[PDB]
């Protein structure tokens, strides 16, 4: 689908939304551990071009991020579903 484009902010540059997706979707499925140290993922996505479509700062702001939110889930039961 993804017919019509939704409303890209930039003319040929992608929203924040857009390339946070990504990295964040490549975060996930690449398996980013979160207890865990930013170099080690760090150099799990280096050699990942999509890591060159957010800056550098951000890159690490939406790790730390994404890594306590990942981490907290553990305070919950389980993703166990009866």
């Known amino acids: 689908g993804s017919s019509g484009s939704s409303g890209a902010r930039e003319r040929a540059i992608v929203p924040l939304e857009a390339r946070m997706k990504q990295f964040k979707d490549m975060l996930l499925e690449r398996g980013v551990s979160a207890f865990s140290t930013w170099e080690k993922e760090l150099h799990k996505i280096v050699f990942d071009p999509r890591y060159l479509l957010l800056n550098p700062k951000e890159r690490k702001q939406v790790f730390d991020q994404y890594v ?10 389980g993703p166990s579903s009866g």
Do not use: L, V
Request: glycine content about 0%.
């Open 68 to 77: 306590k939110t990942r981490a907290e889930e553990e305070r919950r039961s």
